[PDB]
């Protein structure tokens, strides 16, 4: 028996809440729209990772359309003004998009793990990425269809809302037969969707970082073993340490060639090391040094270009991995308050005042942070790629 006005929050706090939600909504809309325009318009952009980025943009658009304004209108107004169909659609879409985002991040990390740690393996094709996207969507559908199929709007008789029309308040919550099944479903969803993909992504990105750094270190070492041993041969006085220097050069040349026209240049370089090794074996150093001094010509004409181009791809590959790590970490950090608040309100038996504080001040903030994550990914993509910056300028110049 409690009468409640149609608007509950103070006008100032309601205004700041709605303006923040509108700001994040506009950011998400603009970012996802420009990302979709960039990926669709430019044909060179289309790759497996970029296809998964487009899928992420589609999921974020689904959140922006079917979840954010509905949640904002639910928060500003008392109870749930919309019908049961709208509430179930909103919740189901939110869950589907969360699962799709997690699985797309996992697929992106797996693809880059294959690209970096095991580059010899063939690169995944566009068709394989598309069927992976389809099976990811199917998995999300089949893992969070129970939320939609089992839901209802319940009427609360003790609170009645009035403007001059009085009606009991309505709210849509998961009406499980008992709290045990709801808790076990929420915990298994947290384990399958958040915790296990978190651990997998973190450990696999760490392994990529280890693998990526090791490749460049060996390349520099082999290059400097060939370079510094060449100076040894020039300054060597007898044939014992010319043989030793040539022995070190040969192993480095074989190692550098193993690292993945380029192999042909190492075929010539190794043959000349053998040519200088035969002269050193014969005994005299002077003609072996002359044969070693001609290795500089092929090193400059076949190996310097190889080393600088091999170095180039390595550096460029880190930036993409770092961006994918940042977007994965920001996704995990943004959804952490929601999952930890659910766990605290479900497992950690707190004081009724603590739960009251949780509902009023912590739940809306965690909900806003999770929804605001959808507007963060386009910012990361634009600021970590010069290609997306060019797309931003082209779209703005075209439409303005």
């Amino acid at each position, epitope marked *: 028996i409690t009468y409640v006005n149609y608007y509950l929050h103070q006008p100032q706090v309601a205004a700041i809440f709605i303006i923040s939600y509108f700001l994040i909504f506009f950011l998400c809309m603009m970012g996802n729209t420009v990302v979709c325009f960039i990926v669709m318009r430019n044909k060179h952009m289309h790759t497996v990772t970029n296809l998964f980025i487009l899928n992420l943009a589609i999921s974020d658009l689904l959140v922006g359309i079917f979840c954010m304004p509905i949640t904002l209108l639910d928060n500003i107004i008392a109870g749930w003004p919309f019908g049961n169909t709208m509430c179930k659609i909103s919740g189901l879409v939110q869950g589907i998009s969360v699962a799709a985002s997690v699985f797309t991040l996992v697929a992106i990390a797996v693809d880059r793990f294959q690209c970096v740690v095991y580059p010899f393996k063939p690169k995944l094709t566009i068709k394989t990425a598309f069927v992976i996207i389809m099976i990811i969507w199917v998995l999300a559908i089949t893992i969070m269809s129970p939320s939609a199929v089992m839901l209802h709007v319940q009427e609360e008789k003790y609170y009645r809302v009035r403007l001059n029309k009085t009606s009991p308040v309505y709210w849509c919550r998961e009406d499980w037969p008992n709290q045990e099944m709801r808790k076990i479903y929420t915990t298994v969803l947290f384990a399958n969707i958040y915790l296990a993909p978190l651990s997998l992504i973190v450990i696999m990105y760490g392994r990529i970082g280890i693998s990526a750094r090791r490749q460049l270190a060996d390349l520099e070492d082999n290059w400097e073993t060939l370079n510094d041993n060449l100076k040894v041969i020039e300054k060597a006085d007898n044939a014992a340490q010319v043989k*030793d220097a040539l*022995t*070190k050069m*040969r*192993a*480095a040349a*074989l*190692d550098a060639q*193993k690292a993945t026209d380029f192999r042909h240049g190492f*075929d010539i370089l*190794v*043959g000349q090391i*053998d040519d200088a*090794l*035969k002269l050193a*074996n014969e005994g005299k150093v002077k003609e072996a040094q002359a044969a070693a001094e001609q290795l500089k010509t092929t090193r400059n004409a076949y190996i310097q270009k190889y080393l600088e181009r091999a170095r180039s791809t390595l550096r460029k590959k880190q930036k993409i991995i770092k961006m994918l790590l940042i977007v994965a970490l920001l996704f995990i950090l943004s959804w952490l308050p929601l999952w930890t608040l659910m766990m605290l309100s479900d497992y950690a038996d707190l004081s009724p005042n603590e739960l009251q504080i949780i509902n009023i001040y912590i739940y809306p903030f965690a909900h806003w942070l999770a929804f605001g994550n959808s507007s963060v990914n386009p910012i990361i993509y634009g600021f970590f790629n010069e290609n997306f910056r060019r797309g931003f300028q082209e779209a703005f110049q075209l439409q303005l």
Partner: antibody
Amino acid sequence: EVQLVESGGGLVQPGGSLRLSCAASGFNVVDFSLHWVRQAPGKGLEWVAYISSSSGSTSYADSVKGRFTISADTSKNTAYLQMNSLRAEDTAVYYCARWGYWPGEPWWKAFDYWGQGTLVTVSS
Amino acid sequence: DIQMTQSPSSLSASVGDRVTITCRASQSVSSAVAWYQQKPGKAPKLLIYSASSLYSGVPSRFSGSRSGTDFTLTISSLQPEDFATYYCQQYLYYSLVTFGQGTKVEIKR
């Protein structure tokens, strides 16, 4: 089918002379380097010498330098290892093996084909 | 000069076992080591070349790998005809060949 066959191994007095012959069938000795690797009774393999008749490049182990000479006659498609001033520790089973030329697989396949090995015994 | 140390000289193992032989090189040669099998009274047979590549015709149970200057041979299932002496050779240059000391795989009892 390629095949290395060793012959000439026999008992000799210390400080004597011997000539091992390695006949190569199937392949030509021009396209491969021929190596001599010896294994003492009860001990492990040790590399003795090699010849590359394409470039005529010969080399010997430090224990046999100045005492063994390796030649290769491509008309008969054979190699020879002349062992003179033989010492008592030169008694062993000698194998003639085939190592291809750089680049590519022939070089990376080291000693893919060996001979049956001929035993030399150096004692008075 | 490139010392090639094959430490696990004694290997007592039974049929079906997964035996492992390690080999340590003094210098940092590339993946240019080979593994040979020699049964008593016969010539060595090439098992592994390039430190990882299986030679043609030999059983697939043998497998070699390289980490740093540590080259390891492995037999996943020790068949009864796998009892022989295994040698670890490095082939960096024609005149620089150093075999390992050899490991005699015997029958566990």
